[PDB]
Short mmCIF file of C-alpha atoms and ligand atoms in Angstrom, two decimals:
data_model
loop_
_atom_site.label_atom_id
_atom_site.label_comp_id
_atom_site.label_asym_id
_atom_site.label_seq_id
_atom_site.Cartn_x
_atom_site.Cartn_y
_atom_site.Cartn_z
CA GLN A 2 0.00 0.00 0.00
CA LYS A 3 1.44 3.37 -1.14
CA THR A 4 0.63 7.03 -0.53
CA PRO A 5 -0.21 9.38 -3.40
CA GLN A 6 2.16 12.23 -4.24
CA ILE A 7 0.39 15.32 -5.55
CA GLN A 8 1.72 18.06 -7.84
CA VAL A 9 -0.23 21.11 -8.99
CA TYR A 10 0.96 23.27 -11.88
CA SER A 11 -0.38 25.46 -14.68
CA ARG A 12 -0.22 24.74 -18.43
CA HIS A 13 0.65 28.37 -19.35
CA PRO A 14 2.34 31.19 -17.36
CA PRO A 15 -0.25 32.18 -14.72
CA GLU A 16 -1.34 35.72 -15.52
CA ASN A 17 -4.26 37.15 -13.51
CA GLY A 18 -7.44 37.38 -15.59
CA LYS A 19 -6.14 35.18 -18.46
CA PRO A 20 -7.81 31.75 -19.01
CA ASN A 21 -5.41 28.90 -18.38
CA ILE A 22 -5.42 25.19 -17.44
CA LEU A 23 -4.60 23.86 -13.97
CA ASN A 24 -3.05 20.39 -13.68
CA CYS A 25 -3.09 18.00 -10.77
CA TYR A 26 -0.68 15.07 -11.23
CA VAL A 27 -1.14 12.25 -8.74
CA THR A 28 1.50 9.55 -8.56
CA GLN A 29 3.12 6.76 -6.54
CA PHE A 30 -0.13 5.22 -5.20
CA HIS A 31 -1.41 1.68 -4.60
CA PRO A 32 -4.10 0.38 -4.70
CA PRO A 33 -5.52 2.10 -7.82
CA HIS A 34 -8.91 3.09 -6.35
CA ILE A 35 -8.58 6.84 -5.66
CA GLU A 36 -10.82 9.92 -5.49
CA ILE A 37 -9.46 13.22 -6.83
CA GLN A 38 -11.16 16.62 -6.70
CA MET A 39 -9.94 20.04 -7.78
CA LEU A 40 -11.08 22.99 -5.61
CA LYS A 41 -11.63 26.71 -6.21
CA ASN A 42 -11.82 28.62 -2.88
CA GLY A 43 -12.40 25.28 -1.08
CA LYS A 44 -15.36 24.23 -3.27
CA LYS A 45 -15.32 21.36 -5.80
CA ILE A 46 -14.90 22.39 -9.46
CA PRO A 47 -17.50 20.51 -11.57
CA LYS A 48 -16.03 19.87 -15.03
CA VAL A 49 -12.65 18.31 -14.11
CA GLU A 50 -11.28 16.08 -16.90
CA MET A 51 -9.27 12.98 -16.02
CA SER A 52 -6.68 10.97 -17.97
CA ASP A 53 -6.97 7.18 -18.05
CA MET A 54 -5.25 5.62 -15.06
CA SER A 55 -1.88 4.10 -15.89
CA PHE A 56 1.22 2.85 -14.11
CA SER A 57 4.98 3.24 -14.08
CA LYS A 58 7.89 0.82 -14.37
CA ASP A 59 7.81 0.37 -10.58
CA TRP A 60 4.07 -0.61 -10.88
CA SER A 61 2.81 2.40 -8.87
CA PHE A 62 -0.20 4.14 -10.44
CA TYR A 63 -0.55 7.61 -11.82
CA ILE A 64 -3.27 9.84 -13.16
CA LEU A 65 -3.62 13.41 -14.40
CA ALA A 66 -6.55 15.70 -13.62
CA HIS A 67 -7.03 19.09 -15.24
CA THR A 68 -9.54 21.91 -15.47
CA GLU A 69 -9.89 25.34 -17.02
CA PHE A 70 -9.08 28.18 -14.60
CA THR A 71 -8.47 31.93 -14.64
CA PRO A 72 -6.08 32.90 -11.86
CA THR A 73 -6.76 36.15 -9.94
CA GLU A 74 -5.38 37.41 -6.63
CA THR A 75 -8.69 36.70 -4.88
CA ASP A 76 -8.93 32.93 -5.71
CA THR A 77 -7.20 29.86 -4.29
CA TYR A 78 -6.97 26.53 -6.11
CA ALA A 79 -6.25 23.11 -4.72
CA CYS A 80 -6.19 19.39 -5.46
CA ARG A 81 -7.78 17.04 -2.87
CA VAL A 82 -7.12 13.31 -2.80
CA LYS A 83 -8.85 10.52 -0.84
CA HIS A 84 -7.09 7.16 -0.78
CA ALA A 85 -7.03 4.04 1.44
CA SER A 86 -3.39 4.72 2.40
CA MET A 87 -4.35 7.92 4.30
CA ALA A 88 -6.72 8.38 7.26
CA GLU A 89 -8.15 11.62 5.75
CA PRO A 90 -8.10 13.53 2.43
CA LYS A 91 -4.80 15.15 1.45
CA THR A 92 -5.10 18.60 -0.03
CA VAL A 93 -2.34 20.39 -1.91
CA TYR A 94 -2.88 24.06 -2.70
CA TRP A 95 -1.66 25.59 -5.91
CA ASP A 96 1.60 27.47 -5.15
CA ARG A 97 0.42 30.42 -7.35
CA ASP A 98 3.79 30.20 -9.22
CA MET A 99 3.68 26.59 -10.56
CA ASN B 7 14.36 3.65 -29.57
CA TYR B 8 10.59 3.36 -29.01
CA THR B 9 9.02 1.14 -26.36
CA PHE B 10 5.53 -0.16 -27.01
CA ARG B 11 3.67 -1.00 -23.74
CA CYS B 12 0.25 -2.58 -23.22
CA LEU B 13 -0.66 -1.99 -19.55
CA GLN B 14 -3.50 -4.06 -18.06
CA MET B 15 -4.93 -3.35 -14.61
CA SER B 16 -7.34 -5.81 -12.98
CA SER B 17 -8.92 -5.19 -9.58
CA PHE B 18 -10.76 -8.07 -7.95
CA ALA B 19 -12.72 -6.72 -4.94
CA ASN B 20 -14.76 -9.83 -3.95
CA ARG B 21 -16.15 -12.95 -5.71
CA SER B 22 -18.88 -10.82 -7.38
CA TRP B 23 -16.92 -7.67 -8.38
CA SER B 24 -13.98 -7.13 -10.70
CA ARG B 25 -12.83 -5.02 -13.60
CA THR B 26 -10.02 -4.99 -16.10
CA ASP B 27 -8.87 -1.81 -17.86
CA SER B 28 -6.00 -1.37 -20.29
CA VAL B 29 -4.02 1.45 -21.87
CA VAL B 30 -1.42 1.25 -24.58
CA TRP B 31 1.56 3.53 -25.07
CA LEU B 32 3.95 4.00 -27.96
CA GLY B 33 6.75 5.82 -26.20
CA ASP B 34 5.03 8.61 -24.25
CA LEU B 35 1.94 8.83 -26.52
CA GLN B 36 -1.19 6.88 -25.68
CA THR B 37 -2.31 4.91 -28.66
CA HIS B 38 -5.20 2.88 -27.20
CA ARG B 39 -7.61 2.50 -24.34
CA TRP B 40 -9.68 -0.52 -23.38
CA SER B 41 -12.15 0.06 -20.66
CA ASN B 42 -13.90 -2.65 -18.74
CA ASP B 43 -17.10 -0.94 -20.00
CA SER B 44 -16.21 -1.53 -23.66
CA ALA B 45 -16.30 -4.70 -25.77
CA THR B 46 -13.97 -3.01 -28.26
CA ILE B 47 -10.51 -1.48 -28.00
CA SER B 48 -10.74 2.31 -28.46
CA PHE B 49 -8.29 4.27 -30.58
CA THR B 50 -6.76 7.36 -29.01
CA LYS B 51 -5.08 8.26 -32.32
CA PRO B 52 -6.30 8.27 -35.97
CA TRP B 53 -3.36 5.86 -36.72
CA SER B 54 -4.06 3.44 -33.77
CA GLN B 55 -4.80 0.56 -36.21
CA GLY B 56 -1.22 0.74 -37.57
CA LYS B 57 -0.98 -1.06 -40.94
CA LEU B 58 -3.52 -3.73 -39.99
CA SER B 59 -6.50 -4.32 -42.24
CA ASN B 60 -9.96 -4.06 -40.79
CA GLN B 61 -10.28 -7.86 -40.61
CA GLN B 62 -6.77 -8.41 -39.17
CA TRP B 63 -7.51 -5.79 -36.51
CA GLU B 64 -10.85 -7.52 -35.77
CA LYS B 65 -9.08 -10.89 -35.31
CA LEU B 66 -6.52 -9.50 -32.94
CA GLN B 67 -9.28 -7.71 -31.00
CA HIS B 68 -11.34 -10.89 -30.84
CA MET B 69 -8.45 -12.84 -29.32
CA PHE B 70 -7.96 -10.14 -26.67
CA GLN B 71 -11.74 -10.25 -26.08
CA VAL B 72 -11.52 -14.01 -25.44
CA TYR B 73 -8.39 -13.53 -23.32
CA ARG B 74 -10.00 -10.91 -21.08
CA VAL B 75 -12.95 -13.20 -20.25
CA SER B 76 -10.62 -16.22 -19.73
CA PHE B 77 -8.23 -14.28 -17.51
CA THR B 78 -11.05 -13.03 -15.25
CA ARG B 79 -12.52 -16.56 -14.99
CA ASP B 80 -9.08 -18.10 -14.29
CA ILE B 81 -8.26 -15.62 -11.53
CA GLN B 82 -11.65 -16.08 -9.83
CA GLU B 83 -11.37 -19.87 -10.00
CA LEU B 84 -7.78 -19.73 -8.65
CA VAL B 85 -8.97 -17.70 -5.63
CA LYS B 86 -11.77 -20.20 -4.88
CA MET B 87 -9.19 -22.99 -5.03
CA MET B 88 -6.70 -21.19 -2.72
CA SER B 89 -9.39 -19.94 -0.28
CA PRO B 90 -9.03 -18.73 2.40
CA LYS B 91 -5.22 -18.52 2.08
CA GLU B 92 -5.33 -15.94 -0.74
CA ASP B 93 -8.15 -13.51 -0.04
CA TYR B 94 -9.77 -10.63 -1.93
CA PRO B 95 -9.08 -7.83 -2.68
CA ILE B 96 -6.54 -8.55 -5.40
CA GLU B 97 -4.80 -6.25 -7.85
CA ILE B 98 -3.12 -7.80 -10.88
CA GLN B 99 -1.10 -5.78 -13.40
CA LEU B 100 0.37 -6.89 -16.73
CA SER B 101 2.99 -4.99 -18.72
CA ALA B 102 3.59 -6.43 -22.18
CA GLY B 103 5.03 -5.27 -25.50
CA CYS B 104 8.29 -4.66 -27.31
CA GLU B 105 11.24 -2.26 -27.50
CA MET B 106 12.17 -1.42 -31.12
CA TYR B 107 15.84 -1.04 -32.22
CA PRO B 108 17.33 -0.24 -35.72
CA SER B 112 13.49 -5.75 -31.17
CA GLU B 113 13.08 -7.44 -27.78
CA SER B 114 9.77 -8.27 -26.08
CA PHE B 115 8.58 -8.61 -22.50
CA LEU B 116 5.58 -9.80 -20.54
CA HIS B 117 5.71 -8.95 -16.81
CA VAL B 118 2.99 -9.56 -14.24
CA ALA B 119 2.61 -8.13 -10.74
CA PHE B 120 0.37 -9.21 -7.85
CA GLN B 121 -0.47 -6.68 -5.08
CA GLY B 122 2.04 -4.25 -6.61
CA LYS B 123 4.96 -6.67 -6.78
CA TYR B 124 6.54 -8.28 -9.86
CA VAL B 125 5.96 -12.06 -9.66
CA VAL B 126 5.69 -13.68 -13.12
CA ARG B 127 7.04 -13.26 -16.62
CA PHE B 128 6.79 -15.00 -19.95
CA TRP B 129 10.31 -15.68 -21.28
CA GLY B 130 11.40 -17.99 -24.10
CA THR B 131 8.72 -20.69 -24.35
CA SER B 132 7.17 -20.67 -20.85
CA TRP B 133 5.65 -18.66 -18.02
CA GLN B 134 7.82 -18.50 -14.91
CA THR B 135 7.75 -17.15 -11.35
CA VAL B 136 10.59 -14.73 -10.59
CA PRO B 137 12.94 -15.29 -7.61
CA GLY B 138 11.20 -14.25 -4.38
CA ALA B 139 7.63 -14.70 -5.72
CA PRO B 140 5.19 -16.47 -3.37
CA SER B 141 5.59 -20.23 -3.65
CA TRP B 142 1.82 -20.82 -4.00
CA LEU B 143 2.16 -19.43 -7.57
CA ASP B 144 4.35 -22.37 -8.68
CA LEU B 145 1.52 -24.86 -9.14
CA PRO B 146 -0.79 -22.58 -11.19
CA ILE B 147 2.16 -21.53 -13.41
CA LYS B 148 3.07 -25.18 -14.09
CA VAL B 149 -0.55 -25.84 -15.11
CA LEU B 150 -0.56 -22.71 -17.29
CA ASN B 151 2.69 -23.97 -18.90
CA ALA B 152 0.93 -27.24 -19.79
CA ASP B 153 -1.42 -25.20 -22.04
CA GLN B 154 0.48 -25.50 -25.30
CA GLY B 155 -1.94 -23.42 -27.42
CA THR B 156 -1.63 -20.45 -25.05
CA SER B 157 2.15 -20.75 -24.98
CA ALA B 158 2.24 -20.83 -28.81
CA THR B 159 -0.08 -17.83 -29.09
CA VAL B 160 1.87 -15.77 -26.53
CA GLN B 161 5.17 -16.62 -28.27
CA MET B 162 3.71 -15.46 -31.61
CA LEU B 163 2.29 -12.25 -30.09
CA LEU B 164 5.58 -11.31 -28.44
CA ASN B 165 8.09 -12.45 -31.05
CA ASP B 166 6.12 -11.66 -34.23
CA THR B 167 2.86 -9.73 -33.81
CA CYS B 168 4.30 -7.00 -31.53
CA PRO B 169 7.29 -5.87 -33.61
CA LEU B 170 5.26 -6.01 -36.86
CA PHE B 171 2.34 -4.06 -35.42
CA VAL B 172 4.71 -1.44 -34.00
CA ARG B 173 6.61 -0.87 -37.27
CA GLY B 174 3.18 -0.20 -38.82
CA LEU B 175 2.35 2.31 -36.03
CA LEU B 176 5.68 4.12 -36.48
CA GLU B 177 4.86 4.58 -40.20
CA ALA B 178 1.18 5.50 -39.84
CA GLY B 179 1.85 7.82 -36.83
CA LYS B 180 5.03 9.46 -38.19
CA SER B 181 3.73 13.08 -38.12
CA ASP B 182 2.47 12.79 -34.50
CA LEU B 183 5.53 10.85 -33.33
CA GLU B 184 7.86 13.42 -34.84
CA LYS B 185 5.83 16.47 -33.78
CA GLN B 186 7.73 19.47 -32.39
CA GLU B 187 5.98 21.66 -29.80
CA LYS B 188 7.69 24.80 -28.45
CA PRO B 189 7.95 25.43 -24.72
CA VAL B 190 6.83 28.61 -23.03
CA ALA B 191 8.89 29.61 -19.95
CA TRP B 192 8.49 31.93 -16.97
CA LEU B 193 10.27 32.79 -13.73
CA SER B 194 9.18 32.93 -10.07
CA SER B 195 10.48 32.47 -6.50
CA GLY B 202 17.03 33.77 4.69
CA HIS B 203 17.96 32.62 1.17
CA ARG B 204 15.76 32.71 -1.95
CA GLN B 205 14.79 29.84 -4.28
CA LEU B 206 14.57 30.89 -7.96
CA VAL B 207 12.22 28.85 -10.17
CA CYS B 208 12.33 28.54 -13.94
CA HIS B 209 9.14 26.96 -15.34
CA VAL B 210 9.16 25.36 -18.81
CA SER B 211 5.89 24.07 -20.24
CA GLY B 212 4.43 22.83 -23.51
CA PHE B 213 7.52 21.17 -25.03
CA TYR B 214 7.53 18.03 -27.15
CA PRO B 215 9.45 15.77 -27.57
CA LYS B 216 10.72 15.08 -24.05
CA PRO B 217 14.48 15.83 -24.42
CA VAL B 218 15.19 19.36 -23.19
CA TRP B 219 17.91 21.43 -21.51
CA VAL B 220 17.14 23.99 -18.80
CA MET B 221 19.85 25.83 -16.85
CA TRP B 222 20.31 28.86 -14.67
CA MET B 223 23.09 31.00 -16.16
CA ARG B 224 25.14 34.01 -15.14
CA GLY B 225 26.33 35.27 -18.51
CA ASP B 226 27.82 32.17 -20.17
CA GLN B 227 28.50 30.30 -16.89
CA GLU B 228 26.19 27.40 -16.03
CA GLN B 229 25.15 27.58 -12.38
CA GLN B 230 25.83 24.06 -11.13
CA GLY B 231 23.44 24.36 -8.15
CA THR B 232 20.56 24.16 -10.69
CA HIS B 233 18.20 21.35 -9.55
CA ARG B 234 16.09 19.92 -12.39
CA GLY B 235 12.64 18.73 -11.18
CA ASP B 236 10.61 15.75 -12.41
CA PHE B 237 9.13 15.78 -15.92
CA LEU B 238 5.36 16.33 -15.44
CA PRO B 239 2.82 15.75 -18.17
CA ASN B 240 0.41 18.33 -19.52
CA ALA B 241 -2.99 17.10 -20.68
CA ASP B 242 -2.19 18.06 -24.35
CA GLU B 243 0.70 15.54 -24.89
CA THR B 244 3.41 18.08 -24.00
CA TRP B 245 5.80 18.23 -21.06
CA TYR B 246 6.32 20.46 -18.03
CA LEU B 247 9.59 20.89 -16.17
CA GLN B 248 11.08 23.29 -13.70
CA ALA B 249 14.66 24.04 -12.74
CA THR B 250 15.35 25.67 -9.37
CA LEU B 251 18.39 27.55 -8.04
CA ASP B 252 19.06 28.48 -4.38
CA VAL B 253 20.64 31.96 -4.08
CA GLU B 254 21.19 34.68 -1.48
CA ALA B 255 19.62 38.12 -1.81
CA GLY B 256 21.37 40.60 -4.14
CA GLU B 257 22.79 37.74 -6.26
CA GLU B 258 19.53 37.59 -8.27
CA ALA B 259 20.76 40.44 -10.49
CA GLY B 260 22.53 39.06 -13.59
CA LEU B 261 20.95 35.57 -13.47
CA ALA B 262 18.97 34.09 -16.34
CA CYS B 263 17.16 30.90 -17.25
CA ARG B 264 18.19 29.43 -20.59
CA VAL B 265 16.14 26.78 -22.39
CA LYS B 266 17.24 24.68 -25.36
CA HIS B 267 14.82 22.48 -27.22
CA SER B 268 14.61 20.77 -30.65
CA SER B 269 11.47 22.74 -31.61
CA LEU B 270 13.15 26.18 -31.25
CA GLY B 271 15.20 26.00 -34.47
CA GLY B 272 18.39 26.77 -32.50
CA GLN B 273 16.95 30.00 -31.04
CA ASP B 274 17.08 29.45 -27.27
CA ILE B 275 14.74 31.02 -24.76
CA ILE B 276 16.65 33.31 -22.38
CA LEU B 277 14.78 34.89 -19.47
CA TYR B 278 16.62 37.46 -17.33
CA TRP B 279 15.50 37.82 -13.70
C1 LIG C 301 10.23 -16.59 -29.22
O1 LIG C 301 11.53 -16.13 -28.86
C2 LIG C 301 12.06 -16.81 -27.72
C3 LIG C 301 13.41 -16.23 -27.32
O2 LIG C 301 13.30 -14.83 -27.11
C4 LIG C 301 13.11 -14.46 -25.72
O3 LIG C 301 11.81 -14.76 -25.20
C5 LIG C 301 10.74 -14.06 -25.88
C6 LIG C 301 9.39 -14.44 -25.28
C7 LIG C 301 10.94 -12.53 -25.86
O4 LIG C 301 10.80 -12.03 -24.52
C8 LIG C 301 12.33 -12.14 -26.36
O5 LIG C 301 12.57 -10.73 -26.16
C9 LIG C 301 13.37 -12.96 -25.60
O6 LIG C 301 14.67 -12.63 -26.08
C10 LIG C 301 12.23 -18.29 -28.06
O7 LIG C 301 12.64 -18.99 -26.87
C11 LIG C 301 13.68 -19.96 -27.12
O8 LIG C 301 13.11 -21.16 -27.60
C12 LIG C 301 14.04 -22.20 -27.88
C13 LIG C 301 13.29 -23.47 -28.29
O9 LIG C 301 12.12 -23.14 -29.05
C14 LIG C 301 14.94 -22.50 -26.68
O10 LIG C 301 16.00 -23.36 -27.14
C15 LIG C 301 16.25 -24.43 -26.20
O11 LIG C 301 17.26 -24.02 -25.28
C16 LIG C 301 17.48 -24.97 -24.24
C17 LIG C 301 18.46 -24.38 -23.25
O12 LIG C 301 17.85 -23.27 -22.59
C18 LIG C 301 18.73 -22.81 -21.55
O13 LIG C 301 20.02 -22.38 -22.01
C19 LIG C 301 20.03 -21.22 -22.87
C20 LIG C 301 21.48 -20.79 -23.12
O14 LIG C 301 22.26 -21.89 -23.62
C21 LIG C 301 19.23 -20.04 -22.31
O15 LIG C 301 18.99 -19.10 -23.35
C22 LIG C 301 17.89 -20.48 -21.74
O16 LIG C 301 17.29 -19.40 -21.02
C23 LIG C 301 18.06 -21.68 -20.81
O17 LIG C 301 18.89 -21.34 -19.68
C24 LIG C 301 18.05 -26.24 -24.86
O18 LIG C 301 18.20 -27.21 -23.82
C25 LIG C 301 17.14 -26.79 -25.96
O19 LIG C 301 17.86 -27.83 -26.64
C26 LIG C 301 17.11 -29.06 -26.77
O20 LIG C 301 15.98 -28.96 -27.65
C27 LIG C 301 16.28 -28.84 -29.05
C28 LIG C 301 14.99 -28.65 -29.83
O21 LIG C 301 14.35 -27.44 -29.39
C29 LIG C 301 17.05 -30.09 -29.49
O22 LIG C 301 17.31 -30.09 -30.89
C30 LIG C 301 18.36 -30.10 -28.72
O23 LIG C 301 19.20 -31.19 -29.13
C31 LIG C 301 18.08 -30.17 -27.21
O24 LIG C 301 17.57 -31.46 -26.85
C32 LIG C 301 16.67 -25.69 -26.94
O25 LIG C 301 17.69 -25.32 -27.88
C33 LIG C 301 15.53 -21.26 -26.03
O26 LIG C 301 16.12 -21.59 -24.76
C34 LIG C 301 14.42 -20.23 -25.82
N1 LIG C 301 14.99 -19.02 -25.27
C35 LIG C 301 14.96 -18.73 -23.97
C36 LIG C 301 15.62 -17.45 -23.60
O27 LIG C 301 14.43 -19.47 -23.14
C37 LIG C 301 10.95 -18.90 -28.60
O28 LIG C 301 11.21 -20.21 -29.09
C38 LIG C 301 10.37 -18.03 -29.71
N2 LIG C 301 9.13 -18.63 -30.19
C39 LIG C 301 8.66 -18.48 -31.44
C40 LIG C 301 7.36 -19.16 -31.82
O29 LIG C 301 9.22 -17.78 -32.26
C1 EMG C 302 -4.07 -3.97 -26.49
C2 EMG C 302 -3.41 -3.52 -27.80
C3 EMG C 302 -2.79 -4.81 -28.31
C4 EMG C 302 -2.27 -4.56 -29.74
C5 EMG C 302 -1.58 -5.87 -30.14
C6 EMG C 302 -0.07 -5.71 -29.99
C7 EMG C 302 0.54 -7.07 -29.61
C8 EMG C 302 0.93 -7.00 -28.13
C9 EMG C 302 1.21 -8.44 -27.71
C10 EMG C 302 1.55 -8.49 -26.22
C11 EMG C 302 0.27 -8.65 -25.36
C12 EMG C 302 0.42 -9.95 -24.52
C13 EMG C 302 -0.97 -10.54 -24.21
C14 EMG C 302 -0.79 -11.62 -23.13
C15 EMG C 302 -2.08 -12.43 -22.83
C16 EMG C 302 -2.47 -13.21 -24.09
C17 EMG C 302 -2.96 -14.65 -23.76
C18 EMG C 302 -3.48 -15.16 -25.12
C19 EMG C 302 -3.86 -16.65 -25.04
C20 EMG C 302 -5.31 -16.86 -24.50
O1 EMG C 302 -6.20 -16.04 -24.73
N1 EMG C 302 -5.54 -18.01 -23.83
C21 EMG C 302 -6.87 -18.39 -23.25
C22 EMG C 302 -7.73 -19.07 -24.31
O2 EMG C 302 -8.02 -20.40 -23.82
C23 EMG C 302 -8.40 -21.50 -24.68
O3 EMG C 302 -7.77 -21.53 -25.97
C24 EMG C 302 -6.32 -21.60 -25.98
C25 EMG C 302 -6.04 -21.67 -27.47
O4 EMG C 302 -5.94 -20.29 -27.82
C26 EMG C 302 -5.78 -22.81 -25.22
O5 EMG C 302 -5.67 -23.96 -26.08
C27 EMG C 302 -6.60 -23.13 -23.91
O6 EMG C 302 -6.42 -24.51 -23.57
C28 EMG C 302 -8.10 -22.82 -23.96
O7 EMG C 302 -8.56 -22.74 -22.58
C29 EMG C 302 -6.63 -19.32 -22.01
O8 EMG C 302 -7.87 -19.58 -21.35
C30 EMG C 302 -5.61 -18.74 -21.01
O9 EMG C 302 -5.69 -19.49 -19.78
C31 EMG C 302 -5.82 -17.24 -20.81
C32 EMG C 302 -5.53 -16.85 -19.40
C33 EMG C 302 -4.11 -17.31 -19.10
C34 EMG C 302 -3.35 -16.02 -18.83
O10 EMG C 302 -2.89 -15.36 -19.77
N2 EMG C 302 -3.22 -15.70 -17.54
C35 EMG C 302 -2.53 -14.51 -17.08
C36 EMG C 302 -1.05 -14.80 -17.24
C37 EMG C 302 -0.66 -15.63 -16.03
C38 EMG C 302 -0.11 -14.67 -14.94
C39 EMG C 302 -1.20 -14.63 -13.76
C40 EMG C 302 -0.31 -14.89 -12.49
C41 EMG C 302 -0.92 -14.50 -11.16
C42 EMG C 302 -0.78 -13.21 -10.67
C43 EMG C 302 -1.37 -12.89 -9.45
C44 EMG C 302 -2.09 -13.82 -8.71
C45 EMG C 302 -2.23 -15.11 -9.21
C46 EMG C 302 -1.65 -15.45 -10.43
C1 NAG C 303 -17.91 -6.13 -3.73
O1 NAG C 303 -17.05 -5.01 -3.93
C2 NAG C 303 -17.66 -3.84 -4.48
C3 NAG C 303 -16.55 -2.82 -4.70
O2 NAG C 303 -15.68 -2.84 -3.56
C4 NAG C 303 -18.70 -3.27 -3.52
O3 NAG C 303 -19.48 -2.24 -4.17
C5 NAG C 303 -19.63 -4.35 -2.95
O4 NAG C 303 -20.05 -3.88 -1.67
C6 NAG C 303 -19.03 -5.75 -2.75
N1 NAG C 303 -20.08 -6.76 -2.87
C7 NAG C 303 -20.19 -7.84 -2.10
C8 NAG C 303 -21.34 -8.75 -2.41
O5 NAG C 303 -19.42 -8.10 -1.19
C1 NAG C 304 -16.43 -5.47 -16.18
O1 NAG C 304 -16.88 -6.09 -17.39
C2 NAG C 304 -17.45 -7.40 -17.20
C3 NAG C 304 -17.73 -8.04 -18.55
O2 NAG C 304 -18.71 -7.24 -19.20
C4 NAG C 304 -18.71 -7.27 -16.36
O3 NAG C 304 -19.43 -8.51 -16.26
C5 NAG C 304 -18.27 -6.69 -15.02
O4 NAG C 304 -19.38 -6.49 -14.16
C6 NAG C 304 -17.60 -5.33 -15.23
N1 NAG C 304 -17.20 -4.83 -13.92
C7 NAG C 304 -17.66 -3.69 -13.40
C8 NAG C 304 -17.18 -3.34 -12.03
O5 NAG C 304 -18.41 -2.94 -14.01
NA1 NA C 305 1.44 -0.71 -7.66
NA1 NA C 306 -0.41 -5.60 -8.95
#
């Protein structure tokens, strides 16, 4: 049983008011059953697209979530992950730079 | 040097619930998807059929269809036989395909996240350290001559031939060039150079002062974008004041020899 690593980064340079894409890359987990949400100001974003689940040479799973977003300096963004390996959801906030 | 990988993931939750899902990669591009939901293998590219005719493709698909049902049945029946010593839930993963050179093939299987079985030569075999209760089922599997013959054909012959067809039919996607965009951001201070949207994967990203490479540059992991391009960052730890004069330099095949230089 292995704990998911979470990385949150933007497709294009984050400029306030310009539409962009936010990525949440979740890796190094086992078993494969996992729940992944992306959050804007703590609330679940509805239209989040998901890649097919796959796995690496070391057999650990990975998956990529993404959604449209427009960064501003009044909005936070996060990726929240529920998985058997952790007692509660793990949330990683977007760094605002990544 | 392209590696073709068919990745199968099977979760068995209890005697009444399981699913098997597959994805197929040529290098770092997904060529196929096969969901438990679907009877047919879905194409994730317009060239995912390679050079195979419609009927040849249909034959190959049919065999995998039969396989998927047989595999699920075999695993369930094996668990009944071993019960209660081997208990649900069970995760099985298969990684199979071929690495093309100017080829070699592999078929690796893992149980609960650990590599346990391969096909090699003419037979299935447990790997050193695998649980000993696998030995009997593998011996029985090895008695099945038709399966052994089919697997040998698939690995030795079908895989390399299929893949040479994919390399031809997918040439413009496989050889696509996508230009990165870069940007900078940041006791000491950590300077971050972000590089996103590049394809193919090979890239060079360095903090510079004039023409001098700053050896403290720490390259991060390659992270995928959702549009089949790559993301990477390179960080440099500096003290205050020092930030003047520094730049991030990016080289990539798509840039026609015109590097990106970003001055802090
Ligand atoms: C498909 O290719 C197989 C080889 O390729 C590897 O496996 C495949 C699945 C891919 O992963 C690929 O990437 C790999 O590189 C090929 O397997 C080979 O099959 C032949 C027989 O069909 C085997 O030959 C027999 O070898 C044994 C000895 O094996 C041991 O020693 C050798 C080194 O000396 C090692 O390589 C082995 O690993 C073992 O340690 C002999 O004892 C035997 O001789 C006896 O039998 C012959 C008749 O077959 C008689 O005439 C003789 O007098 C003897 O009585 C064979 O010569 C070969 O070992 C096996 N390779 C491996 C690595 O096991 C497979 O046949 C291909 N199938 C098709 C349909 O194309
Ligand atoms: C997806 C894109 C693909 C594009 C194509 C590119 C080519 C890639 C080629 C590489 C892919 C490798 C595929 C490997 C699996 C293929 C197996 C094909 C053979 C097959 O069906 N056999 C079943 C059909 O059975 C009947 O007919 C055959 C004749 O064809 C026999 O004569 C047999 O007697 C008859 O029953 C068999 O039923 C067979 O048993 C299928 C299941 C066996 C199997 O493959 N099991 C999984 C491998 C064993 C490892 C499990 C080990 C394990 C792990 C964890 C816990 C316990 C055990
Ligand atoms: C079997 O597992 C599935 C998924 O874990 C679950 O929905 C269901 O409760 C289980 N069913 C039985 C009969 O145990
Ligand atoms: C997976 O597909 C098989 C074959 O159609 C089906 O019987 C099974 O219920 C599916 N599993 C799930 C969890 O949907
Ligand atoms: Na794993
Ligand atoms: Na596994």
